[PDB]
Design a protein around this ligand. Structure first.
Ligand SMILES: Cc1ncc(C[n+]2csc(CCOP(=O)(O)OP(=O)(O)O)c2C)c(N)n1
Ligand SMILES: Cc1ncc(C[n+]2csc(CCOP(=O)(O)OP(=O)(O)O)c2C)c(N)n1
Ligand SMILES: [Cl-]
Ligand SMILES: [Cl-]
Ligand SMILES: [Cl-]
Ligand SMILES: [Cl-]
Ligand SMILES: [Mg+2]
Ligand SMILES: [Mg+2]
Lengths: 665, 665
């Protein structure tokens, strides 16, 4: 049968590439190839000629170690994955990295490897599909309509982020999300029973999922059957548990954890090929009949599906020209001409938390930017993230723009990544800066994939006060500044906050963390003028010395900028002139040339005090060896916030006092 | 009824404390007072006169926003929490912080606030209780035998950490763990149905838990019946869903999310006490007959119980004097005198990954230190954590010392906090450094509570190779360096690894992260002699300049110390003389006096190159303004590790070219 031979071809390309690499994970591709074959050639709607076709079904390999299965299917389907690419598995600069990397392989929809997260990112994709369908499907035109598939394994189902995401997806009745569970009773350290014994069916049923079981993971009629039932039932996400033998066919290693994560070896790979009836003498061998089978089943149907969808789009264009022009910009990642003029501008004196001015920026933008979409992990009323009038994102009204993620920071991070990968949306999530730790691995995959997600991180310091040190960030700032390709902006007032929002929405290729206060911040007088370009360049001179030549520089961020300005005013009354530097974003300031940075931090002004309510790690770069740091390198406390700040030294007097010491006065 | 009157006292005290603080969370205490009084006064075995009684039931309030419910029961029961303490809720330095703080309050077993983690810490405590029962109990002496209780809310049960922990606890059949779920259909933003609609009972049964439902959370008899059923089924852990009205008794605010986290206000407070029939008209008032009731239900029974256990203990001493002697030492936190003699010492040049030398050290410490208990998150084969011959921690064999946490990093981390809090064990957990992000919030809780937990974090760098950038740490070091009260050690070789393990085990008041390699690192010349004092001082000259007069300093950590010594050798062969500095721990170095710091880092020697395969943040502190940093501020790649390290510039020839450039040579 041609189906069997395609499946053996997949199994054997995967083995050989892993042998040549002397590295990788054979056991999962060997057992999962039939289910992956069946989904890829019989149910999934995609076009190898255009992996960016916007209405394609989205596929996610959550069990990322199995990546040679993905690459085998990509290559045989005619994606731009060549045979030489498969012979470069796990090699420097290749298009077949050991775990799936989005942006490095055509057709790969998401970077996985960190277990659990792929499922949750698929949930994100399925949410973007329903929200987009409800925004653009009008008057008989079903322009957004597609499934989200994922293959996961035992480890994915032990990770909490996948529990969070399954709960959320079932709650939202995401009927177009179908997960195939590679259920092989094996994890990395040995038998599944070492660590895991849940009734997975009963658990996914408690979330509101359709559960289906495949007894024989090699029987493609039982698999295709399960897939038909899953695609039929659009009222619930589906989990298809497919019982497999890890390393199926290896006479000595099938069913053992030894086959999870190291090459079969030349001896056992020979015996496996014999067990497969794979007669052929050559390695990396694909019979022409297999390329032909894949042409017939995938390449050629895929191009007609997309052609036929291009026809429906052209008619929608003519029927609904504005709506289609909006959709086309959304797909292209563009914002509506002139949206930015809708941003608020705040006068000096006006005092409100930067979480509150964030709240106002959001609603101001939300009208001008239809593509904005997001929410909070059960803190909308504290983070100030609600889009008023925007609607609740619910199965009865997927057009609603407010997502109620629940107390699931980590699912929220990864769903956000998934929505951004889908395309068509600008997306944000809110929580307390301290609990940004709960989604830390999702922030990392955003950075690695270069996804311009936006984190709304409020309650940024010890000024939080009474809820105490579990709720008071100290190190989180430093911990994000050290992450590559993560933009971090801690705006100093309402105007820097609108600037920060603007830059974050203009980002195309990296996540932005917005660090915001619980407590009021009075608006500075220069920021209305300078914030957008000032924040654009990471740091600037928000308040220059009045006598032009500063005797020392005060360096501050967020709320502390106001503190430093009031110290400046006290100091100049005494005849001591300093320049205050706002430093809303280290990463963007380091992106500028030294010509600019030297205009902000003039080398001749060696006396520099840093002022920031957070760990000191890193501050020596900017204050230098004659400078001083006023920071916090200890945990906080449970007390009114202005009192903590005082006992920790963030007072006008102590700033003046430390500045005077720097100058020998 | 005296029962009602005590329950109403709890409620009023909670309301009054929040009013006076003008901050706090009345909703949960108001709804959950009955269940907590029932557990506290009728089932828990505890002694207010000794909160450290070792065989007490352990209680954790996972829903830590309800702190005043805990402080009320502690005050009323005769723990060292005064009325003045209750009147200082949420104030500076007070014994009643806004969320419970272990070590800041008598009777408080864990710091909570961050949702989900309370349940998983309680799982760890129950794990501790069974490992210690299996170790010390003998026929006729069930000397270790007590329950673990927690109270959680809806938010706890959305958190991934509590799904992981529940799964593991069901798998481990921890029948003595009983969780009371305050099920009030409300969360912080509104109704539970915004975000959460699952069948909790069905999910928890899928884990292997017993599920019990109390329909009227004010009926203390129905609560008592569930606790009796739950305490009687020791084959499974129990979840009791207690249907409660949040803010019960407040005629306006009961059952709304506005009573979650703000004071009632004086009006609603008056109206609430009216509904309760509380007519004393004095804030912070306790009827004398309520104290007397708690003294009859808690104080006197508690002293009798500990006293009976102490009689038991002395009987156990007589019949099993050696085990009783070992038990007493474990309880008091001591290590077997002389244990450190057992640590291995490695000849120079012996070449071994520090994960493998960690493995060796682990089994050396384990043979000499019975109380060592630990495991990995499905990465024992790769982290090298297995205790050989130590047995498997299962219900067959709770005396087994190897714990299979599964792919549950965060539950692992939180459960380690639980075991350290219980007392009597030295605990560790293994996973990839890059996946330490998955347990970040529990690392923070260890630091905050000062628990000498040990993290075994292998695969520390790009040397990991073919698995790619999702698996290669970059920023993790900087992220842990910035955290208060966390010790981070990245040993240079096998001897610094031995010394690191020794210091992490010797710790009493802070956790320790061990940053270990995948790849071999040769053992340096001088570490056999210098490692212990050297790592103890955080940084030390490991290879001083041959001629005694350094032209520059090479600063390095971990596997890069090797590289630095080769460069030094090459440099010396051209007439250039540099000193090499090992810095296994920044935190330990900063704890040295300046006189010693200036001796390792002579202010005279301005020309310094730091060398570390991770983010640059904070190295300017040690290289200074005329310094240079050879670091990695980008993500990694999929390739053989050697290939990546060379492309990223960690080669002998490149360190030499940098050093010469520093010296204008
Ligand atoms: C978050 C995370 N933790 C740990 C790992 C290491 N790891 C990779 S696969 C795996 C488990 C393998 O078991 P399963 O998912 O059942 O896959 P199978 O071996 O059956 O292919 C683990 C722990 C990981 N990649 N991500
Ligand atoms: C990890 C984490 N996320 C968010 C918060 C903020 N927060 C505190 S309580 C809560 C949820 C409130 O619901 P529930 O747990 O049901 O408590 P109830 O209001 O019913 O007392 C949230 C999100 C937190 N403390 N920790
Ligand atoms: Cl608040
Ligand atoms: Cl104790
Ligand atoms: Cl203590
Ligand atoms: Cl004995
Ligand atoms: Mg498996
Ligand atoms: Mg609730």
């Amino acid at each position: 049968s041609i189906e069997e031979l395609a499946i053996t071809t997949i199994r054997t390309l995967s083995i050989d590439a892993i042998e040549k690499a002397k590295s990788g994970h054979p056991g999962m591709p060997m057992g999962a190839a039939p289910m992956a074959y069946t989904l890829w050639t019989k149910f999934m709607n995609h076009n190898p000629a255009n992996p960016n076709w916007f209405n394609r079904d989205r596929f996610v390999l959550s069990a990322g170690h199995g990546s040679m299965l993905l690459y085998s299917l990509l290559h045989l389907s005619g994606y731009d994955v060549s045979m030489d690419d498969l012979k470069q598995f796990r090699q420097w600069g290749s298009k077949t990295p050991g775990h799936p990397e989005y942006g490095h392989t055509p057709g790969v929809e998401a970077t996985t490897g960190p277990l659990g997260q792929g499922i949750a990112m698929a949930v994100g994709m399925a949410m973007a599909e329903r929200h987009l369908a409800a925004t653009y499907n009008r008057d008989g035109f079903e322009i957004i309509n597609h499934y989200t598939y994922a293959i996961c394994g035992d480890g994915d189902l032990m990770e909490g982020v996948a529990s969070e995401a399954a709960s959320l997806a079932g709650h939202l009745k995401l009927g177009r999300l179908i997960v195939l569970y590679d259920s092989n009773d094996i994890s990395l350290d040995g038998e599944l029973n070492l660590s895991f014994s849940e009734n997975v069916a009963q658990r996914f049923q408690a979330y509101g999922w359709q559960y289906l079981r495949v007894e024989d993971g090699n029987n493609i009629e039982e698999i295709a059957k399960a897939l038909e039932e899953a695609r039929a039932d659009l009222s619930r996400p589906t989990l298809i548990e497919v019982k497999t033998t890890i390393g199926y066919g290896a006479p000595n290693k099938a069913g053992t954890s030894g086959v999870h994560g190291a090459p079969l070896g030349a001896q056992e790979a020979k015996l496996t090929k014999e067990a497969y009836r794979w007669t052929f003498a050559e390695d990396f061998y694909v019979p022409e009949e297999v390329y032909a089978h894949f042409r017939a089943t995938v390449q050629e149907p895929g191009a007609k599906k997309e052609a036929k969808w291009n026809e429906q789009l052209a008619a929608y264009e003519q029927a609904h020209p504005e709506l289609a022009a909006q959709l086309k910009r959304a797909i292209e990642g563009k914002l509506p001409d002139g949206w930015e003029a809708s941003l608020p501008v705040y006068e000096a004196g006006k005092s409100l938390a930067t979480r509150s001015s964030s709240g106002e920026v959001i609603n101001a933008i939300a009208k001008a930017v239809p593509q904005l979409f997001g929410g909070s992990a059960d803190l909308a009323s504290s983070n100030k993230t609600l889009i008023k009038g925007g609607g609740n994102f619910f199965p009865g009204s997927y057009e609603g723009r407010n997502v109620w993620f629940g107390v699931r920071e980590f699912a929220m991070g990864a769903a956000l990544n998934g929505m951004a990968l889908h395309g068509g949306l600008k997306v944000f999530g809110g929580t307390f800066f301290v609990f940004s730790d709960y989604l830390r691995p999702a922030i990392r995959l955003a950075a690695l994939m270069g996804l311009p997600v936006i984190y709304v991180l409020t309650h940024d310091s010890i000024a939080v006060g009474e809820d105490g040190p579990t709720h008071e960030p100290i190190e989180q700032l430093a911990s994000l500044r050290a992450m590559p390709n993560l933009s971090v902006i801690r705006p100093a007032d309402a105007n820097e906050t609108a600037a920060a929002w603007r830059l974050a929405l203009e980002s195309t290729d990296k996540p932005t963390a917005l660090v915001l206060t619980r407590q009021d911040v009075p608006t500075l007088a220069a920021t209305a003028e300078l914030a957008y370009e000032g924040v654009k360049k990471g740091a600037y001179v928000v308040s220059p010395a009045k006598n032009g030549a500063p005797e020392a520089l005060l360096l501050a961020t967020g709320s502390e900028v106001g503190l430093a300005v009031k110290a400046q005013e006290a100091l100049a009354a005494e005849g001591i002139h300093v320049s205050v530097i706002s430093m809303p974003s280290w990463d963007r300031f380091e992106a500028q040339p030294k010509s600019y940075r030297d205009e902000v931090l003039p080398p001749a002004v060696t006396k520099r005090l840093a002022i920031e309510m957070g760990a000191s790690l890193g501050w020596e770069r900017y204050v230098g060896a004659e400078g001083d740091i006023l920071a916090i390198d200890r945990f906080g406390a449970s007390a009114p916030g202005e009192k903590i700040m005082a006992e920790y030294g963030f007072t006008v007097d102590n700033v003046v006092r430390r500045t005077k010491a720097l100058l020998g006065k």
